[PDB]
Design a protein around this ligand. Structure first.
Ligand SMILES: CCCCCCCCCCCCCCCCCC(=O)OC[C@H](COP(=O)([O-])OCC(O)COP(=O)([O-])OC[C@@H](COC(=O)CCCCCCCCCCCCCCCCC)OC(=O)CCCCCCCCCCCCCCCCC)OC(=O)CCCCCCCCCCCCCCCCC
Ligand SMILES: CCCCCCCCCCCCCCCCCC(=O)OC[C@H](COP(=O)([O-])OCC(O)COP(=O)([O-])OC[C@@H](COC(=O)CCCCCCCCCCCCCCCCC)OC(=O)CCCCCCCCCCCCCCCCC)OC(=O)CCCCCCCCCCCCCCCCC
Ligand SMILES: CCCCCCCCCCCCCCCCCC(=O)OC[C@H](COP(=O)([O-])OCC(O)COP(=O)([O-])OC[C@@H](COC(=O)CCCCCCCCCCCCCCCCC)OC(=O)CCCCCCCCCCCCCCCCC)OC(=O)CCCCCCCCCCCCCCCCC
Ligand SMILES: CCCCCCCCCCCCO[C@@H]1O[C@H](CO)[C@@H](O[C@H]2O[C@H](CO)[C@@H](O)[C@H](O)[C@H]2O)[C@H](O)[C@H]1O
Lengths: 140, 112, 52, 226, 108, 8, 140, 69, 69, 88
């Protein structure tokens, strides 16, 4: 329901806004000197651009120009099938699994050294309390 | 007076926070560090060298690359010990009972 | 030379570096070409301490 | 044997940990009182944001059933926001406890399939916001690693800044929203990379002669640029 | 019956309260927090001068634990902050010299 | 400090 | 009309379904949270009666089984979802008549109160301003 | 004008890049859908094509979103 | 006119019932939302209230629905 | 054996779109460093007895806005030499 839409906003010209077009503007037409310049360069053997050469020296890896019907319209395309490399071991990661819940080194490290240190501190304080309780129990 | 800080200004807020009665050391906020990779890296390096898990755990040591220590703990040692004595005796300095030591420390640290 | 001109031929601080639009300059670099490269037509230079 | 005798000095001495506790327990030790953080800012669900989206201000749809009541950012904040720390600022754009859209999967293969199709990461869904201290620690570690990677690099602080902005914008839980903030620094890094390559490998071009009307007015100064 | 644990958790709560009251500009609340911070503990008082002169592995352990609990660097000029830091460090030192900390995830 | 904390 | 809105009569079926889903999700979340709490407490206590006692920590009535709305009622002059038996001609109402040299009401159809339509045809819709004595344009 | 005659290697900021891509999208839509107009692309013209029996109905009410309280 | 003067016990068919409820809904909306206008209720008036800084943007493209092939 | 009755690649992990790119004159999601004044462009100028371009703001190409203010928006037809209304 997008094509062939209705006029949604109004069209208008504010009072005394200028137009900058004379009465012969419809007979006016544009022009570029580029075609004539190209003909003259070709006829006089003037310096050509490097875009006439399909090989590309502007990088270290091989590029070749693809032309769209004219030497003025080109794109460079790389030729190499680049090899990629990964200094990574396989099977060392399971991101779907939540690792903060599992008990182990991987779990503590998916958690933090801060949480592990806090846990160790609680452990030490608990050990102090339980040592006191053991002492008073066994002195009796 | 204290106007809202938009989300685009938060990176500057983290390292140049507004003034408080208890400010941090803004000059040292880029020096606060705590490595979560310390022990994993240590274990990996030692196991690659060729040691066993027990040897690695015996050779393991805690990170020295943490936030630096306050120099006041070494410079204002006696003043701090005296303030803590006053607090322990006078119930945390209620009704201005450790003001003597606290003011001496403040003057020593600030110098007008 | 710029750093010395700023600090009056005196002992400058340590690890002082120059930047333009967030881009650190080497000290064996021509200021003109460095600005041409990093901050074209915005020569506002900044001196900061690079401890990191 | 009573449980936790010495562990509630906040209760024995009427010390509030926050103005909400002060208001609740009626300690009245906060001179400025308390403006409660409403529930739509305390919790909620992820929403769409752009006006060029049809489901704007609507909750994000997931494979699992999720409450569709959304987190509402503070659009009309009060003038005085006495606490301008990150702790109080982050509540205007994210909930500190995270969003309420997390799943509890009945099976492991559902988890697997959601991850495989790009609809679940625990990093994103079972997590809180990061505290300023955590953000700073992460940023400083990253900065140290980058400085070790190369000191004589001009794009260094730009990379550090995009990392910093992602962390501050909480990209773990709102990656699209954070990338929207940080791609500017990525673009600046992209520019600095070429500016460095062209300074290392000497690349220049033949500049044309000066234009006839380089100066608009004869009495104007033509400030020279490198 | 669990004094070490209780006082630890109380100290942490009071530190959090001090920080919140500082952010919210509340001298009354933050002075209450400072006053309620377990200054009458003989064990921690005895361990304070021991911590002030310790060195090496024990000091590094205690520094690691303190940076875990409180990584923000306090202002060198604020003696109340300095003193609460010292008190927390002395408490951790006492706990460590009674029963040392085991901070690594790898352990057996 | 870093150059991007500067704004003025 | 306000009573009908309380019952969701002016809502659409999408809105009804969304409200239904919202209730479902809230209830599910309450249940799963209560289960986590119950299992934790019963695990630390090692007692099944605790799990049993968490069965009554949250029953007014039930959710509705079916819902009816206003958009399910049919409408249409030609829609056969409204036609049971033909209505006699002497009981059907007449359309208004206007015919003069200046104006009429037979060159177009405005439609009903609900099912409206443009009186002018496609070729003169762009020039509607020309068939008016007064024109008050849109705001945009 | 900024790259080839003033010497700027990076003429477009993020805003200008967005504007370029916006105009690219508008070109694509204008060539894809015949007669597309303002609400989807910034464009208005009068001589439009309509079906012949144009029905006029009220929009549906805005969708009730769930909210707290 | 149909019930009390012609003798019809059931004056309204299903269409007329729908029309009655439509008008009831429009009354409710007109009294609930101040200034509501055409697309939601059949009503047009000129003297409207606008914010003061009226922004104009393109609508988003229609939502891509999944389809076979 | 039914484990291999159905693997081209994988689905993408993340996606990027055009609406995630920021836009705005005042939006700070686009501001890294200030652009110098001698590099910022000028707005067009029109001033005469008959007409001007300073009593209003039309906006940018994307973020447009009504040039007229709220009190005269209902009477826009009166500030025009020609008016071509909507189709409805
Ligand atoms: C109170 C204040 C007092 C103090 C003053 C203070 C001011 C001091 C400063 C001076 C002012 C500067 C202000 C800033 C200027 C910037 C503004 C501006 O310029 O643009 C605005 C304004 C903005 O327009 P725009 O929308 O932006 O478009 C811009 C275009 O570029 C331009 O628009 P355009 O090109 O579309 O319009 C041109 C127009 C007009 O173009 C011309 O007229 C060209 C000039 C020719 C003039 C000479 C011919 C005269 C013929 C007279 C004979 C008639 C018959 C005699 C009858 C007698 C009985 C009455 O074209 C036509 O209408 C079509 C004509 C085509 C044919 C013309 C060529 C053939 C000529 C021969 C005729 C033969 C016809 C044969 C037909 C074919 C048969 C086979 O520009 C114009 O409109 C230009 C035309 C304005 C005309 C004004 C009409 C009044 C003229 C009288 C002025 C007062 C006279 C004083 C006394 C002297 C006379 C007696
Ligand atoms: C299933 C099968 C169904 C089949 C279908 C069956 C159909 C149904 C069954 C049919 C059964 C058969 C029934 C028969 C057919 C029924 C027809 C019917 O009912 O008609 C309804 C039908 C209209 O029904 P409607 O529903 O109301 O339609 C909408 C309205 O009509 C819309 O109105 P409007 O907005 O368009 O405005 C129109 C305007 C039109 O009004 C005007 O035209 C006024 C124009 C006057 C301008 C000049 C005035 C100069 C005087 C100035 C006064 C002093 C100045 C004071 C200042 C204020 C006054 C200006 O207002 C009037 O109409 C007023 C009428 C009253 C004045 C009439 C004047 C008559 C004088 C005659 C003079 C005779 C002189 C003879 C000399 C002979 C030569 C020597 O009739 C029409 O078509 C209306 C137009 C009728 C033409 C009247 C034209 C009078 C103009 C006289 C000009 C005098 C100047 C003479 C100059 C020559 C000497 C030099
Ligand atoms: C950060 C800081 C920034 C700060 C800001 C700084 C600002 C910038 C820096 C400034 C630096 C300082 C620079 C100085 C200031 C610059 C100002 C400037 O640039 O101006 C631009 C500025 C406009 O710039 P713009 O961007 O183009 O604005 C948009 C357009 O202007 C819009 O155009 P429009 O659509 O509104 O149309 C206007 C229309 C307006 O044109 C008309 O008004 C024509 C009306 C004529 C009707 C009657 C004609 C009768 C003749 C009939 C001819 C034969 C019939 C043939 C049929 C065709 C012709 C009708 O067209 C024209 O304007 C054509 C102008 C050319 C004709 C001029 C005629 C001059 C004759 C003078 C006669 C002197 C007699 C003295 C007798 C003394 C008493 C004894 O100037 C204006 O304001 C425009 C209006 C100027 C007034 C002209 C009025 C002439 C009317 C003469 C009437 C003669 C009758 C006398 C009767 C009394 C005797 C009985
Ligand atoms: C049928 C008969 C045909 C006769 C043909 C006549 C040929 C006339 C050709 C003259 C062309 C000269 O062209 C113009 O000259 C001047 C110097 O002279 C050039 O040089 C000028 O501009 C450029 C930069 O813009 C710089 O060199 C310098 O700022 C200025 O001197 C212009 O760049 C060039 O546009």
């Amino acid at each position: 329901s997008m094509d062939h839409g209705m006029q949604y906003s109004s069209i208008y010209w504010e009072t005394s806004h200028r137009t900058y077009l004379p009465f012969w503007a419809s007979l006016t037409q544009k022009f570029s000197w580029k075609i004539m310049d190209d003909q003259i360069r070709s006829f006089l053997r003037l310096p050509k651009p490097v875009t006439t050469e399909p090989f590309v020296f502007s990088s270290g890896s091989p590029y070749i120009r693809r032309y769209f019907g004219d030497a003025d319209i080109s794109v460079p395309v790389p030729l190499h099938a680049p090899a990629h490399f990964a200094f990574v071991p396989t099977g060392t990661v399971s991101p779907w699994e939540e690792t903060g819940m599992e008990t182990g080194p991987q779990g503590a490290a998916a958690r933090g050294a801060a949480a592990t240190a806090f846990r160790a501190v609680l452990e030490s304080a608990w050990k102090c309390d339980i040592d006191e309780q053991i002492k008073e129990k066994l002195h009796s | 007076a204290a106007s809202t800080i938009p989300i685009s200004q938060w990176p500057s807020l983290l390292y140049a926070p507004p003034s408080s009665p208890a400010n941090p050391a803004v000059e040292a906020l880029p020096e606060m560090q705590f490595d979560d990779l310390h022990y994993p890296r240590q274990m990996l390096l030692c196991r690659g060298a060729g040691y066993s898990l027990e040897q690695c755990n015996r050779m393991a040591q805690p990170d020295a690359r943490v936030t630096p220590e306050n120099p006041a703990e070494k410079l204002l040692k006696e003043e701090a010990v005296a303030a803590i004595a006053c607090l322990s005796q006078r119930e945390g300095g209620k009704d201005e009972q450790c003001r003597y030591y606290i003011e001496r420390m403040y003057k020593l640290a600030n110098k007008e | 030379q710029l750093k010395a001109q700023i600090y009056g031929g005196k002992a400058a601080p340590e690890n002082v570096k120059v930047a333009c639009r967030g881009r650190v300059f080497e000290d064996a670099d021509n200021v003109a070409m460095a600005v041409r490269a990093f901050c074209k037509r915005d020569p506002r230079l900044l001196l900061f301490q690079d401890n990191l | 044997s009573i449980l936790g005798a010495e562990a509630f000095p906040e209760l024995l001495s009427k010390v509030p940990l926050n103005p909400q506790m002060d208001e609740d327990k009626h300690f009245n030790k906060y001179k400025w009182g308390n403006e409660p953080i409403p529930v739509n800012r305390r919790t909620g669900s992820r929403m769409n944001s752009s006006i060029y989206d049809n489901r704007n201000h609507e909750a994000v749809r997931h494979p699992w059933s999720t409450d569709a009541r959304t987190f509402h950012p503070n659009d009309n904040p009060e003038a005085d926001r006495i606490n301008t720390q990150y702790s109080n600022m982050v509540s205007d754009s994210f909930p500190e406890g995270g969003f309420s859209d997390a799943p509890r999967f009945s099976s492991n293969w559902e988890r697997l399939l959601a991850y495989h199709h790009g609809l679940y990461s625990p990093e994103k869904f079972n997590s809180t916001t990061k505290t300023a201290d955590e953000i700073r620690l992460a940023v400083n570690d990253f900065a140290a690693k980058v400085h070790a990677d190369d000191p004589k690099n001009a794009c260094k602080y730009l990379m550090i800044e995009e990392f910093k902005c992602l962390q501050s914008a909480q990209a773990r839980i709102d990656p699209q929203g954070a990338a929207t903030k940080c791609v500017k620094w990525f673009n600046e890094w992209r520019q600095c990379a070429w500016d460095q390559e062209k300074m290392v490998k000497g690349y220049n071009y033949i500049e044309d002669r000066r234009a006839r009307k380089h100066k608009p007015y004869i009495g104007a100064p033509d400030l020279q640029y490198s | 019956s669990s004094p070490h644990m209780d006082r630890l958790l109380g100290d942490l709560k009071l530190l959090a309260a001090y920080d919140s009251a500082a952010g919210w500009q509340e001298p009354k609340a933050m002075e209450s927090a400072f006053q309620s911070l377990s200054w009458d503990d003989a064990d921690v008082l005895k361990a304070l001068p021991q911590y002030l002169n310790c060195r090496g592995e024990q000091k590094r352990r205690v520094d690691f634990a303190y940076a875990a609990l409180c990584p923000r660097p306090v202002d060198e000029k604020d003696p109340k902050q300095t003193l609460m830091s010292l008190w927390m460090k002395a408490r951790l030192f006492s706990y460590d010299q009674k029963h040392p900390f085991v901070l690594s995830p790898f352990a057996a | 400090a870093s150059p991007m904390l500067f704004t003025d | 009309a306000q009573l009908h809105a309380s019952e969701g009569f002016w809502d659409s079926e999408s809105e009804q379904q969304e409200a239904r889903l919202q209730r479902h999700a809230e209830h599910r979340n309450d249940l799963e949270t209560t289960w986590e709490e119950a299992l934790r407490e019963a695990t630390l206590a090692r007692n099944f009666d605790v799990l049993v006692s968490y069965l009554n920590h949250g029953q007014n009535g039930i959710p509705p089984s079916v819902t009816w709305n206003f958009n399910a009622m049919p409408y249409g002059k030609e829609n056969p979802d409204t036609k049971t038996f033909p209505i006699p001609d002497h009981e059907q109402p007449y359309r208004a008549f206007s015919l003069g040299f200046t104006a009429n009401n037979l060159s177009g159809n405005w439609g009903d109160y609900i099912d409206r339509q443009d009186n002018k045809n496609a070729l003169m819709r762009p020039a509607r301003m020309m068939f008016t004595d007064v024109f008050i344009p849109t705001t945009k | 004008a900024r790259y080839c005659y003033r010497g700027l290697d990076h003429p477009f900021t993020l805003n200008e890049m967005k504007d370029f891509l916006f105009k690219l999208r508008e070109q694509y839509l204008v060539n894809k859908y015949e007669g597309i107009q303002f609400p989807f692309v910034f464009r208005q013209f009068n001589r439009v094509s309509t079906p012949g029996t144009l029905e006029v109905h009220t929009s549906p009410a805005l969708q009730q979103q769930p909210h707290f309280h």
